[PDB]
């Protein structure tokens, strides 16, 4: 699962059958690291109008 | 594909089904690949 976003430590608690979490637009906003089983929020990188 | 969803709930009602809400988490996804049209559950006898 590829993407680009800021990774932060997450307060969400995944059930053991869950690997990722989807938002309204079905983009992965939370993910479980497959080596150390911890949850990470994926806030997107900042977008601006110049 | 044989999907097992499971939930354990502490109940204390005597006879009928309890009235409430409890979502079943998926337990085992089992690779059998066979035709199933009829089933039968297994009980245990008590001998004395
Ligand atoms: C290796 O991955 C497993 C999950 O498949 C994890 O439980 C374990 O802690 C990992 N070990 C190391 C050394 O990363």
Swiss-Prot record, chain B:
| Annotated phenotype, changing residue 16 to G | In strain: Beta/B.1.351
Effect after changing residue 14 to E: In strain: Omicron/XBB.1.5, Omicron/EG.5.1
Q: Gene symbol? A: S
Q: What does this protein do?
A: Attaches the virion to the cell membrane by interacting with host receptor, initiating the infection. The major receptor is host ACE2. When S2/S2' has been cleaved, binding to the receptor triggers direct fusion at the cell membrane. When S2/S2' has not been cleaved, binding to the receptor results in internalization of the virus by endocytosis using host TFRC and GRM2 and leading to fusion of the virion membrane with the host endosomal membrane. Alternatively, may use NRP1/NRP2 and integrin as entry receptors.
Question: Which residues are glycosylated according to the annotation?
Answer: 35
Q: How does it assemble?
A: Binds to host ACE2. RBD also interacts with the N-linked glycan on 'Asn-90' of ACE2. Cleavage of S generates a polybasic C-terminal sequence on S1 that binds to host Neuropilin-1 (NRP1) and Neuropilin-2 (NRP2) receptors. Interacts with host integrin alpha-5/beta-1 (ITGA5:ITGB1) and with ACE2 in complex with integrin alpha-5/beta-1 (ITGA5:ITGB1). May interact via cytoplasmic c-terminus with M protein. May interact (via N-terminus) with host bilirubin and biliverdin, thereby preventing antibody binding to the SARS-CoV-2 spike NTD via an allosteric mechanism.
The reported result of mutating residue 14 to G is: In strain: Omicron/BA.2, Omicron/BA.2.12.1, Omicron/BA.2.75, Omicron/BA.4, Omicron/BA.5, Omicron/BQ.1.1
* Source organism phylogeny: Viruses, Riboviria, Orthornavirae, Pisuviricota, Pisoniviricetes
Q: What is the name of this protein?
A: Spike protein S1
Record the organism: Severe acute respiratory syndrome coronavirus 2 (2019-nCoV)
